[PDB]
Amino acid sequence: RRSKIAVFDKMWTYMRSAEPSVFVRTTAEGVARVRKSKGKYAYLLESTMNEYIEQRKPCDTMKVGGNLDSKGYGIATPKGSSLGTPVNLAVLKLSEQGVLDKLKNKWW
Amino acid sequence: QRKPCDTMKVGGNLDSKGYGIATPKGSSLGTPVNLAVLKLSEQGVLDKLKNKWW
Amino acid sequence: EQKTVVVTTILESPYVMMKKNHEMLEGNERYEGYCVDLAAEIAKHCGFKYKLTIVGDGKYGARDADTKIWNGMVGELVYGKADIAIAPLTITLVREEVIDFSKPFMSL
Amino acid sequence: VGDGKYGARDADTKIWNGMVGELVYGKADIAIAPLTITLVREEVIDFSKPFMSL
Numbered sequence A: 001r002r003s004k005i006a007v008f009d010k011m012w013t014y015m016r017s018a019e020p021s022v023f024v025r026t027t028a029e030g031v032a033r034v035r036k037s038k039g040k041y042a043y044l045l046e047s048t049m050n051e052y053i054e055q056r057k058p059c060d061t062m063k064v065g066g067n068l069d070s071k072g073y074g075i076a077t078p079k080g081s082s083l084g085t086p087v088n089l090a091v092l093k094l095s096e097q098g099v100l101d102k103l104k105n106k107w108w
Numbered sequence B: 001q002r003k004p005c006d007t008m009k010v011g012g013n014l015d016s017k018g019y020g021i022a023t024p025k026g027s028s029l030g031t032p033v034n035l036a037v038l039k040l041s042e043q044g045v046l047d048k049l050k051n052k053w054w
Numbered sequence C: 001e002q003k004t005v006v007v008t009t010i011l012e013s014p015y016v017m018m019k020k021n022h023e024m025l026e027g028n029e030r031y032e033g034y035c036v037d038l039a040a041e042i043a044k045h046c047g048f049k050y051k052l053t054i055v056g057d058g059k060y061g062a063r064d065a066d067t068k069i070w071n072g073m074v075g076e077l078v079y080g081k082a083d084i085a086i087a088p089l090t091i092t093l094v095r096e097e098v099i100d101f102s103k104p105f106m107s108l
Numbered sequence D: 001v002g003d004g005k006y007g008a009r010d011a012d013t014k015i016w017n018g019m020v021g022e023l024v025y026g027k028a029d030i031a032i033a034p035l036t037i038t039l040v041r042e043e044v045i046d047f048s049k050p051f052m053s054l
Helices: A006-015 A027-034 A047-054 A086-096 A099-107 B030-042 B045-051 C034-046 C073-078 D018-024
Strands: B022-024 C005-009 C050-054 C061-063 C070-072 D045-047
Touching: A086 A099, A086 C034, A099 C034, B022 D018, B030 B045, C005 C073, C034 C050, C061 C073, C070 C073, D018 D045
Parallel strands: C005 C050
Antiparallel strands: B022 D045, C061 C070
């Protein structure tokens, strides 16, 4: 809705005018659609979940292309916590020595 | 994207990092700069600028 | 005297799952997955033991446009119930008004 | 920048040479460059959230 960009507006124009009902309310309703008209309905969601779903049975779904934007998760603390320095430093260390990468390799 | 366009990229990545704004510690600039930086990622300006050179 | 920090998080896959035998256990062993793993690597560099908790409403969190009440984990921090939040909370503009996120641990 | 380097911790002088020096010694007021973020900088200068992936 927000975009400046011609390609994204061109897509939104269809996605706001397509019929029958193109949107879905939940991840489950999406996955339940994508398996139906096989090859015909594409669906967009969080790339982490997109990669996750492929690794399970029936494996009949897979990722393509690449990311359109960059966002990220982070540790969160109350305002003015005394932990606001040690945790913030520590997260760097766990990334600089690949510990997070190892855990991702494990859990995916 | 430079002439003669004879290189080729390979798809993939091996790590993750990112550049960012920095200041002396305890400057009055600190929080208002940081709060400002996100808005330019929210309103997409950084993408249009990225196109404008790459 | 000593305090063990109240770790809080949200039910999400595979970020937080019940252990195989979660009916038969107390302490952190009731749970399995990514966040419970990461919390150990944080605490072992930040100097504490910790007790896990699940957020009451099962939602990440938002601010009511009407009452301007915060609900969800950010609100529970603002009202001082939980001590620290270790969850796939998306970093966004408005959330920086009330809590002091670290650098991100993973891009998406 | 004075001399074309981001700067690093000097060997056993413990000086901060290079561009980082322009902020650690207060010579300058703010930095805006591609500038890799790592523990050795986070001790002495703050950073915003990152504005770009790589």
